[PDB]
Amino acid sequence: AQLLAANEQKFKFDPLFLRLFFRESYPFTTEKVYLSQIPGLVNMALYVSPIVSGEVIRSRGGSTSEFTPGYVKPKHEVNPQMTLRRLPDEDPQNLADPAYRRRRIIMQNMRDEELAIAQVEEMQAVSAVLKGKYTMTGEAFDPVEVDMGRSEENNITQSGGTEWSKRDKSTYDPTDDIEAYALNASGVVNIIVFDPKGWALFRSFKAVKEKLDTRRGSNSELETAVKDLGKAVSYKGMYGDVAIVVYSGQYVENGVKKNFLPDNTMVLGNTQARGLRTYGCIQDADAQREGINASARYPKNWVTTGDPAREFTMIQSAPLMLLADPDEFVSVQLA
Amino acid sequence: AQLLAANEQKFKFDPLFLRLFFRESYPFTTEKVYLSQIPGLVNMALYVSPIVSGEVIRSRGGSTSEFTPGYVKPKHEVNPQMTLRRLPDEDPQNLADPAYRRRRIIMQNMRDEELAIAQVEEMQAVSAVLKGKYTMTGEAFDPVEVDMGRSEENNITQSGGTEWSKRDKSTYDPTDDIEAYALNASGVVNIIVFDPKGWALFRSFKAVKEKLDTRRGSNSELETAVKDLGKAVSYKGMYGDVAIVVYSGQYVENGVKKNFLPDNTMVLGNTQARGLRTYGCIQDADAQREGINASARYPKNWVTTGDPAREFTMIQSAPLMLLADPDEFVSVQLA
Amino acid sequence: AQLLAANEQKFKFDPLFLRLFFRESYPFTTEKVYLSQIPGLVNMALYVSPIVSGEVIRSRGGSTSEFTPGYVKPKHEVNPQMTLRRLPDEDPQNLADPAYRRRRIIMQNMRDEELAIAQVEEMQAVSAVLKGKYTMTGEAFDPVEVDMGRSEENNITQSGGTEWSKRDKSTYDPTDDIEAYALNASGVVNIIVFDPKGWALFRSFKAVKEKLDTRRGSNSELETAVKDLGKAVSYKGMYGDVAIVVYSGQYVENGVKKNFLPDNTMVLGNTQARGLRTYGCIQDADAQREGINASARYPKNWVTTGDPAREFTMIQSAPLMLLADPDEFVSVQLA
Amino acid sequence: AQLLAANEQKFKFDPLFLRLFFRESYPFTTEKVYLSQIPGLVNMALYVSPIVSGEVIRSRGGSTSEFTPGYVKPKHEVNPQMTLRRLPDEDPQNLADPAYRRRRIIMQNMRDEELAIAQVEEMQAVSAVLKGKYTMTGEAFDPVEVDMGRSEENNITQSGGTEWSKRDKSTYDPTDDIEAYALNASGVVNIIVFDPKGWALFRSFKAVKEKLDTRRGSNSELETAVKDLGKAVSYKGMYGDVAIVVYSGQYVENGVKKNFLPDNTMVLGNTQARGLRTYGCIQDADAQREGINASARYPKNWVTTGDPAREFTMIQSAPLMLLADPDEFVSVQLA
């Protein structure tokens, strides 16, 4: 089999949601997840007298600090009969050799599984911060639930009483509503991510159009993040002070492609949230043997024999995408 | 006779279907096509507990997996009498040289080849997503049928009771019908590309002409494909949760021109639908001598004697365009 | 006289009707034009057996292929007695040199004369696409008609029925007319070039002025060439998916300026429509000595004797501007 | 322990007040602070005939001097159970070394307290321009009052018969009121920074927005100073010759957050009001041995034994934020 040095990818293609909010990462050197080792938040400076005395600042993790990592393994085989993807500038001559055949099919595999698992971290992250509730299920795996701690005030539903659809599209101005929903944000909002369907009814108001900024985009280096993964990510401009973005992310279910977000559901928050990327240990003999259990991903390959006389490649991971303050976002359930 | 390295075209102008749905390309080293050897989709990551070895991710093959490749292979003469388009001020002195003249004309002939063989791919693709049913038959070749796997739910007719022509252009709203049609689409729908005439009656609906968003700065990099194929693709604007495109493309048979699409039709579809570009082996006696059996196209310069004492240039290929999920679209014929 | 190589102009300033639609040039070595010699159209494909050899495909499509090239030859004398535009700070004493001044005026004489033949090409193009016929008559030259093949269903007059004049400029939407004239286009329309006063009444329409996307630097790249020769061409901007421009240039007759277009006229065209820049031959024995019988423009310098005791400079060329499709554009007589 | 020179911070993160009002800094070489040692302001010329030497100008400044600064001092442990944040593209090979990990942890700590220290002089300035009174209290602190010399008209609250909340939200013009507030400013008013909840009331008047120039780019230098504080500060627009800022930064007490400003409050001043940044001696026996008694901050690292057997990192300073003219700002408590 190919050795562990066969990890030559160094590509950062996380679709817009591991990049805007959870920029950091905290691998663990323990099987569970403890918030005690999390640095947490800074505190005051505590006015005190001169050198007469002095006391130590000690940072707690709160009360609940136990979590179960979302450990998972995708498996692939290296059957040297699979049809190779017709990449451009690819000579069939140096493809006839089975040596290149194998080393390319294994790598194409490698990519498709981190793509799948990356879809998975994004799915769990959006599940966590879409309403503050979060869950962990799967066949051949015990069901697990996790409470982020979101306040009831940050899950407003538009359907109740005053919707957005049955108002006048020419006079009803949504600045009042967006400000009334951004006041209870525990922080000034600057990212106003929309959904492909919900954006239409929001933009339908003509009062929106004129005030909208569209001159090339003038927010920040966020444009660089947007134009890279521009397929499911669309950028319009400025709402006068804040960024207007529509996310149309997709994930592959058993056999159906499904949107990342429910249609008429909006997210409101900051561009600099504090989001956790905790990981569990790599519960296997070899990684412990090289002591690399504290990592995001683990590739490894072998040839197993006897009943399955075939060769297999694994990726192991254990995410628990987490947010420090669930209340720096509000979920608008539009209708 | 000129060598096999006379294939310098680098023209990537597939007309709107190989580039939007059929981004996935696959040659074979075998005569026929075997559906089992396509890697297929990648499922989510389905979760497993870290106590048991996981389940092997395998591409599940369908009931029918063996079809007949679409061998098509035209040629042309290279009589050094053909006129030349005047390249701008590249030393017209060499135009007198027949050696440079034939060398110039061969690229033009091969470009004619490429544009001619592009059309068979797109007429196969349009048949695929208009019916999921495909017939490849012609003179000096046996009839061939490919049943892609479409269901009847994706071929509903506007003539089934109430028709848009048999409605009111002023008060009736066709949107509800649009979501009704997209219901049995087996996934996300964001392109409902119309016919050149099939939209003129659609736009007559009053609700349409304000609900459509004709403003620029539209959905995504999608519109760049419009700037490439600017001869037959118009982008009418945004319809909310879906884009609107009108395609007036035409293919040219022996002497006359014909539209690709019927007069009143539309398709319920996704921009992420995966399309297969499988290519059969080059059944050329020479080709096997160089191990070039696996490719997309195949040129050759050759000299004929005795009865047709001229020399020719040849292009051979075998497109058998296929779709992963035929039922991802819904073909509504309008009335 | 001067060397024949003294032709250093290379400052192509074709007035937007040779750089928009007539990018393709086709000089001949035959004194007449043979339209069947131009490649033109080539048909789709055939389904052939992989074994039996396919038949050669020929290049037909043109039946009438005979026309008379547009020969014109202006000329000028070189007497060193004119008044010269004193360029900034280059000639302290060089103005005294007769040869230097002679070469300067010869260069200036050329720079002056190419404008005349540019005007001829421009009127050829506009006479082609404003009414679909062509007439070619000049004193000391025979009259001759050129038939493009334009159908009358591209020469609709707005006066027919209810024109824009007896129409509301605040409530009525002229777009309905726009598609009411764009259906018979044989290709997607994105050029709607207007006349100054013709667009003036068009601009009066309200629906235009809220739909007129005037924002500069549009996604269209035609304006990159527009600012070059902007002396007589404006750029209105976008009208959704289409590009609106106004042209108001004038050709100089023997003593005055004259607008190319009749006041109330407008056009419908596609951004990449194919137009022919075919040129006739140089029926000059002196030119034919060097085998320059196939060229674009031909200079000459030579000293006259006996009756007009002077020195002359010849510029001779035979443009016979043609189109791939005569009915592709639609010319509507505004009202 | 670590050397004192290990002070690799180089970060300028002053929260909107030390970076705009208190640019000048004046450390003290004595334990207490004497206000009378500020440089002060200078008279006109003392016009004099050029025959006799004049009197020497001496600037003293203020009368009261005997103030005493607060002596906060954060101290922290470096217990190597710290789960290090996984730096991107960092090799886990260095993760093995305890020394590298310890150095990383201490550098993370230094940032931790440098965020912990900025807040105290932040609300020092907040209290400075809120009423001009400054009370500093706390356990083991001997609370001290500080009188900056403010008048009462600098603290007018809108509490009369008519308030911004209980009048017309359409016809009332807030200008006359804002100049009524800014007339007694002892200078040109330039900053009208808002508390977001108060701004919610302010923007309710439309007469704001038909004159609100919220163009991107405040003055081309304010954004050069405020973009770094992307979490707490926001810039609205121009009210003509003046700027509008909304600040919602929060200082966190032992367990919860709290906003710096009182909710329905706003303040008026100028961008050039000079503010003192006086600091005091660092009463560290080591500091006297290294001659650094006069400084802003002081790092330290040492290894204790026996009772708290650990090793600790230490910071201590003496902030007594001051403004030259307390009356240069007026505080309106909105209602």
**Phi, psi angle pair for B125, to nearest 5°:** -65, -40
User: Residues C58, C62, C67, C72: what is their CA dihedral angle, to the nearest 10 degrees?
Assistant: -70
Q: How far apart are CA C40 and CA C62, in angstroms?
A: 8
Count CA within 13 A, CB hemisphere, residue B265: 19
For residue B57 the two structure tokens come to 């991710």
Sign of CA dihedral C32, C34, C35, C38: negative
Residues of B in contact with C51 (CB under 8 A): 283
For residue B280 the two structure tokens come to 């059969």
8 Å CB contact of B47 and A141: yes
Length of chain A in residues, anyone?
A: 335
User: How far is the alpha carbon of B294 from chain A, nearest alpha carbon, in Å?
Assistant: 7
User: Residues A251, A252, A257, A261: what is their CA dihedral angle, to the nearest 10 degrees?
Assistant: -20
Residues of A in contact with D214 (CB under 8 A): 240-241
Q: Classify strands D243-247 and D233-238 as parallel, antiparallel or unpaired.
A: antiparallel
Longest dimension (CA), chain A: 81
In the chain, the amino acid numbered B316 is Q
The closest of A25, A5, A1, A23 to A295, measured between CA atoms, is A25
Are C208 and C202 in contact by the 8 Å Cβ rule? The answer is yes
Q: Which B residues in the span 49-68 are in contact with C, Cβ-Cβ below 8 Å? A: none
Q: How far apart are CA C246 and CA C196, in angstroms?
A: 6
Q: Which A residues in the span 192-211 are in contact with B, Cβ-Cβ below 8 Å? A: 196-197, 200-201, 203, 209
The closest of A290, A312, A296, A313 to A111, measured between CA atoms, is A313
DSSP 3-state of B295: coil
Residues of A in contact with B190 (CB under 8 A): 196, 248
Show the DSSP H helices in B212-330 as ranges: 222-228
Q: How far apart are CA B178 and CA B198, in angstroms?
A: 15
Q: How far apart are CA A329 and CA A269, in angstroms?
A: 4
User: How far is the alpha carbon of A185 from chain B, nearest alpha carbon, in Å?
Assistant: 28
D248 close contact with A: CB closer than 8 A: yes
Burial of D215 (0-12, 13-18, 19+ CB in 10 A): exposed
Longest dimension (CA), chain B: 79
**Phi, psi angle pair for C57, to nearest 5°:** -105, 125
User: How far is the alpha carbon of A46 from chain B, nearest alpha carbon, in Å?
Assistant: 46
Contacts of A301 (CB under 8 A, 6+ apart): A1, A2, A6, A78, A106, A311, A312, A313, A314
For residue C229 the two structure tokens come to 């020769």
User: How far is the alpha carbon of B56 from chain C, nearest alpha carbon, in Å?
Assistant: 40
CA distances from B50 to A295, A316, B42, B54 (A): 16, 10, 21, 9
Are B81 and A289 in contact by the 8 Å Cβ rule? The answer is no
Q: CATH number, domain at B255?
A: 3.30.1930.10
Q: How far apart are CA B287 and CA C320, in angstroms?
A: 47
A29 close contact with D: CB closer than 8 A: yes
> CB atoms < 10 A from the CB of B240, how many?
19
In the chain, the amino acid numbered B126 is V
Helix (H) or strand (E) holding B332: strand B330-333
Q: How far apart are CA A22 and CA A125, in angstroms?
A: 9
For residue D334 the two structure tokens come to 């909105």
The dihedral region occupied by C81, where left means phi > 0, alpha psi between -120 and 50, and beta the remainder, is alpha
C-alpha distance across the termini of chain B, in Å? 56
* Chain A neighbours, 3+ Cβ pairs < 8 A: B, D
Are A48 and D139 in contact by the 8 Å Cβ rule? The answer is yes
Disruptive mutation site among A32, A86, A233, A265 for chain B (greatest number of B CBs within 10 Å): A86
Are B199 and B236 in contact by the 8 Å Cβ rule? The answer is yes
Q: How far apart are CA B273 and CA C105, in angstroms?
A: 66
A95 close contact with B: CB closer than 8 A: yes
Note whether D touches C: 3 CB pairs or more under 8 A. no
Are D335 and D163 in contact by the 8 Å Cβ rule? The answer is yes
Please name every residue paired with C269 in a beta bridge, in sequence order, or none if there are none: C191
The closest of A169, A134, A165, A166 to A149, measured between CA atoms, is A134
8 Å CB contact of B241 and A200: yes
Q: How many CB pairs under 8 A join A and D?
A: 123
Q: How far apart are CA A46 and CA D10, in angstroms?
A: 24
Which one-letter DSSP state was computed for residue C56?
P
Nearest neighbour of D116 by CB, restricted to A45, A53, A240: A45
Report DSSP letters for C135-167, one per residue: EE--TTS--EEEE----GGG--BTTSSS-STTS
Sign of CA dihedral A14, A16, A17, A23: positive
In the chain, the amino acid numbered C32 is K
8 Å CB contact of A119 and B44: yes
> CB atoms < 10 A from the CB of C55, how many?
12
Q: How far apart are CA B10 and CA B310, in angstroms?
A: 28
Q: How far apart are CA B66 and CA C57, in angstroms?
A: 32
The closest of A133, A56, A79, A7 to A308, measured between CA atoms, is A79
Show the DSSP H helices in chain D as ranges: 98-131, 174-182, 196-202, 206-209, 222-226, 285-289
Residue with tokens 């981004």: B23
Q: How far apart are CA D209 and CA D236, in angstroms?
A: 11
In the chain, the amino acid numbered A124 is Q
Are A184 and A237 in contact by the 8 Å Cβ rule? The answer is no
Nearest neighbour of D197 by CB, restricted to A45, A183, A186: A183
Nearest neighbour of A139 by CB, restricted to B46, B219, B279: B46
DSSP tally for chain D: helices H, then strands E? 6, 15
Q: Which C residues in the span 275-304 are in contact with B, Cβ-Cβ below 8 Å? A: 291, 294-296
From the centroid of its chain, how far is CA A322? Answer: 10
Q: How far apart are CA C104 and CA C111, in angstroms?
A: 11
In the chain, the amino acid numbered A135 is T
> CB atoms < 10 A from the CB of C81, how many?
6
* Chain D neighbours, 3+ Cβ pairs < 8 A: A
Disruptive mutation site among C21, C48, C288 for chain B (greatest number of B CBs within 10 Å): C48
B46 close contact with A: CB closer than 8 A: yes
B9 close contact with A: CB closer than 8 A: no
8 Å CB contact of D86 and A24: yes
User: How far is the alpha carbon of A53 from chain B, nearest alpha carbon, in Å?
Assistant: 51
From the centroid of its chain, how far is CA A313? Answer: 25
Disruptive mutation site among A81, A83, A233 for chain B (greatest number of B CBs within 10 Å): A83
* Chain B neighbours, 3+ Cβ pairs < 8 A: A, C
In the chain, the amino acid numbered D241 is D
Angle at D165 between CA D159 and CA D171, to 5 degrees: 115
Residue with tokens 């058998």: B320
Longest dimension (CA), chain D: 80
**Phi, psi angle pair for D85, to nearest 5°:** -60, 130
Residue with tokens 């007497």: C79
In the chain, the amino acid numbered C226 is V
Residues of C in contact with B234 (CB under 8 A): 188, 190, 241
Report DSSP letters for C248-305, one per residue: --EEE-SSSEEESS-TTEEEEB-TT--EE--B-----HHHHHTT--S-S-EEEEEE--
Are A155 and A132 in contact by the 8 Å Cβ rule? The answer is yes
> CB atoms < 10 A from the CB of D90, how many?
12
Please name every residue paired with B164 in a beta bridge, in sequence order, or none if there are none: none
Residues of D in contact with A295 (CB under 8 A): 92
Residue with tokens 């069901």: A143
Q: How far apart are CA C26 and CA C323, in angstroms?
A: 12
Angle at A125 between CA A123 and CA A128, to 5 degrees: 110
Residue with tokens 């919610």: D200
**Phi, psi angle pair for C236, to nearest 5°:** -70, -40
Burial of D285 (0-12, 13-18, 19+ CB in 10 A): exposed
Report DSSP letters for D233-293, one per residue: EEEEEESSSSEEEEE--EEE-SSSEEESS-TTEEEEB-TT--EE--B-----HHHHHTT-S
Residues of B in contact with A263 (CB under 8 A): 241
In the chain, the amino acid numbered A332 is V
Residues of D in contact with A41 (CB under 8 A): 252
The closest of B298, B334, B318, B319 to B127, measured between CA atoms, is B319
Strands (E), chain A: 26-27, 33-34, 66-67, 75-77, 133-136, 144-147, 233-238, 243-247, 250-252, 257-259, 265-268, 275-276, 278-279, 298-304, 310-316, 322-323, 330-333
Q: How far apart are CA D58 and CA B191, in angstroms?
A: 80
Report DSSP letters for B152-205, one per residue: GGGS-BTTSS--STTS-TTT---HHHHHHHHHTTSS---B--B-TTTTTTTTTS
The dihedral region occupied by A108, where left means phi > 0, alpha psi between -120 and 50, and beta the remainder, is alpha
- SS3 labels along C90-106: CCCCHHHCHHHHHHHHH
Are A271 and A191 in contact by the 8 Å Cβ rule? The answer is yes
The closest of C270, C24, C182, C16 to B229, measured between CA atoms, is C270
Give the structural domain span for D157.
152-274+326-333
Helix (H) or strand (E) holding D135: strand D133-136
DSSP 3-state of C77: strand
Burial of B115 (0-12, 13-18, 19+ CB in 10 A): middle
For residue B323 the two structure tokens come to 């779709």
Own/partner pairs, C135-140, CB within 8 angstroms, 24+ separation: C136/C68, C136/C70, C138/C72
Closest CA in chain B for residue C39: B83
The closest of B288, B193, B311 to B246, measured between CA atoms, is B193
The closest of A184, A174, A183, A158 to A244, measured between CA atoms, is A174
Q: How many CB pairs under 8 A join B and C?
A: 126
Q: Classify strands B275-279 and B24-27 as parallel, antiparallel or unpaired.
A: parallel
Resolution (A): 5.0
Closest CA in chain B for residue A198: B241
DSSP 3-state of D220: coil
Note whether B touches D: 3 CB pairs or more under 8 A. no
Are D188 and D240 in contact by the 8 Å Cβ rule? The answer is no
Are A321 and A125 in contact by the 8 Å Cβ rule? The answer is yes
B141 close contact with C: CB closer than 8 A: yes
Nearest neighbour of B140 by CB, restricted to C48, C271, C272: C48
Q: How far apart are CA A57 and CA B35, in angstroms?
A: 65
Length of chain C in residues, anyone?
A: 335
User: How far is the alpha carbon of A49 from chain B, nearest alpha carbon, in Å?
Assistant: 54
* Chain C neighbours, 3+ Cβ pairs < 8 A: B
In the chain, the amino acid numbered B38 is I
**Phi, psi angle pair for B281, to nearest 5°:** -70, 155
C224 close contact with B: CB closer than 8 A: no
8 Å CB contact of B86 and C27: yes
Are A47 and D138 in contact by the 8 Å Cβ rule? The answer is yes
Closest CA in chain A for residue D205: A176
C-alpha distance across the termini of chain C, in Å? 55
8 Å CB contact of A48 and D140: yes
Count CA within 13 A, CB hemisphere, residue B45: 30
> CB atoms < 10 A from the CB of A246, how many?
22
**Phi, psi angle pair for B82, to nearest 5°:** -65, 145
Note whether C touches B: 3 CB pairs or more under 8 A. yes
In the chain, the amino acid numbered D22 is F
What technique was this entry resolved by? Answer: cryo-EM
Closest CA in chain B for residue A319: B47
8 Å CB contact of C39 and B73: no
Disruptive mutation site among B47, B242, B325 for chain A (greatest number of A CBs within 10 Å): B47
The closest of A292, A319, A291 to A33, measured between CA atoms, is A319
Q: How far apart are CA C44 and CA C50, in angstroms?
A: 18
**Phi, psi angle pair for D21, to nearest 5°:** -115, -25
> CB atoms < 10 A from the CB of D331, how many?
21
User: How far is the alpha carbon of B167 from chain A, nearest alpha carbon, in Å?
Assistant: 25
